[PDB]
Amino acid sequence: TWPAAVPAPLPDVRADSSTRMLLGPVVDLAVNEHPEGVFYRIPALATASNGDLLASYDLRPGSAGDAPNPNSIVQRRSRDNGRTWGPQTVIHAGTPGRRKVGYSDPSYLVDPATGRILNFHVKSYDRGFATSEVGTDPDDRHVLHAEVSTSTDNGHTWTHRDITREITSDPTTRTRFVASGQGIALLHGPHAGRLIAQMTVRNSVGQQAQSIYSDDHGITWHAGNPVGRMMDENKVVELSDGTLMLNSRDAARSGRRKVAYSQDGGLTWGPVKLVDDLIDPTNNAQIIRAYPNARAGSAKARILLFTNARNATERVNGTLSVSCDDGRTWVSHQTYMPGEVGYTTAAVQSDGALGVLWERDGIRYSTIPMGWLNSVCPLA
Numbered sequence: 091t092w093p094a095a096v097p098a099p100l101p102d103v104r105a106d107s108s109t110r111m112l113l114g115p116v117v118d119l120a121v122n123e124h125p126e127g128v129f130y131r132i133p134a135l136a137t138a139s140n141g142d143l144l145a146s147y148d149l150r151p152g153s154a155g156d157a158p159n160p161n162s163i164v165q166r167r168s169r170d171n172g173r174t175w176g177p178q179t180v181i182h183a184g185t186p187g188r189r190k191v192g193y194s195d196p197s198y199l200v201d202p203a204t205g206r207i208l209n210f211h212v213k214s215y216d217r218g219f220a221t222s223e224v225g226t227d228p229d230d231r232h233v234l235h236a237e238v239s240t241s242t243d244n245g246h247t248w249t250h251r252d253i254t255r256e257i258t259s260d261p262t263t264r265t266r267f268v269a270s271g272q273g274i275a276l277l278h279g280p281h282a283g284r285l286i287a288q289m290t291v292r293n294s295v296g297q298q299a300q301s302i303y304s305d306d307h308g309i310t311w312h313a314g315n316p317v318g319r320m321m322d323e324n325k326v327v328e329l330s331d332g333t334l335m336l337n338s339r340d341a342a343r344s345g346r347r348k349v350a351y352s353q354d355g356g357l358t359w360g361p362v363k364l365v366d367d368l369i370d371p372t373n374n375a376q377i378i379r380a381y382p383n384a385r386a387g388s389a390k391a392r393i394l395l396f397t398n399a400r401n402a403t404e405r406v407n408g409t410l411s412v413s414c415d416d417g418r419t420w421v422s423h424q425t426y427m428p429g430e431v432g433y434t435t436a437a438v439q440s441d442g443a444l445g446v447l448w449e450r451d452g453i454r455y456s457t458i459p460m461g462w463l464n465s466v467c468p469l470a
Contacts, residue, residue: 097204207245
């Protein structure tokens with residue numbers, strides 16, 4: 091059995107001797123058809139409180155099918171910042187057959203104040219995102235359910251619970267999923283301590299974005315008010331003053347990301363607008379603070395990193411985008427992976443470099459050392 095996790099600060103980008111952005115070796119975390127008829131999709135990447143690097147994704151049996159294909163959430167771990175990886179472990183295993191259960195679309199949320207790690211994902215029976223019915227009974231086979239897996243030992247062992255009920259206050263909400271990738275712990279302003287992740291829902295209004303949050307460090311979850319229309323997988327990031335930003339996939343396919351702001355820790359959001367500067371093919375993406383610990387008013391606090399497929403129509407060209415100004419503008423886009431990338435994610439590693447994941451015939455990992463950042467967003 092493993093030691094209990096101890097509180098520790100999230101990592102910040104550190105400087106490197108690199109002068110430009112250069113992908114490191116490509117590591118093949120999981121390869122489709124290894125073993126036969128097994129497919130891998132939907133990446134999540136986090137740095138656990140002990141500095142371990144953790145990669146989560148779906149194992150999909152038979153084909154790469156979404157929920158209700160009876161999937162499993164699996165993980166691999168690096169103790170040396172991406173260099174080498176342990177073998178796969180199961181977070182939660184699905185079961186096949188008439189009474190199939192599926193666990194699918196993972197996101198991490200690391201709490202630095204306690205060392206605990208969360209892995210959100212769906213729990214499916216017979217119904218997917220689109221065909222799920224209204225109802226919150228844990229055994230309802232027509233409901234797409236929300237599960238959270240909790241680890242207190244840096245991601246070695248997990249325990250499971252359905253959070254569907256406590257995050258459904260509008261009874262017409264017929265479906266939900268936490269967006270895969272990573273949520274956040276707030277570190278600044280009046281809501282510091284709050285844990286938060288973004289959902290996509292369908293309700294009587296339309297297909298909306300919706301925050302779920304915890305002020306008791308992950309024992310209970312509550313849903314904020316929903317926002318927007320034609321919303322899809324969206325991610326929340328804490329801006330330099332503790333204002334929150336949501337960055338969203340656009341189910342209407344404008345060719346762009348969508349963005350909204352919250353002044354109350356995700357309880358309420360304002361208007362959803364296009365981000366003209368962020369070309370997206372209607373696809374998942376991740377936005378993260380480069381220096382999460384940095385205080386309001388500093389130059390480090392306003393730096394956001396963003397990965398997506400920078401293309402209007404196709405999920406190709408995994409691109410790191412940089413904002414120096416709390417996401418008001420995007421001054422730099424650089425493709426780190428030409429060709430098919432599918433869903434991409436990124437996270438700051440404990441050595442201060444950036445870790446990335448993308449989908450190409452399974453799940454692939456690489457590292458972007460970060461020394462070159464000062465020349466795009468100066469620190470003084």
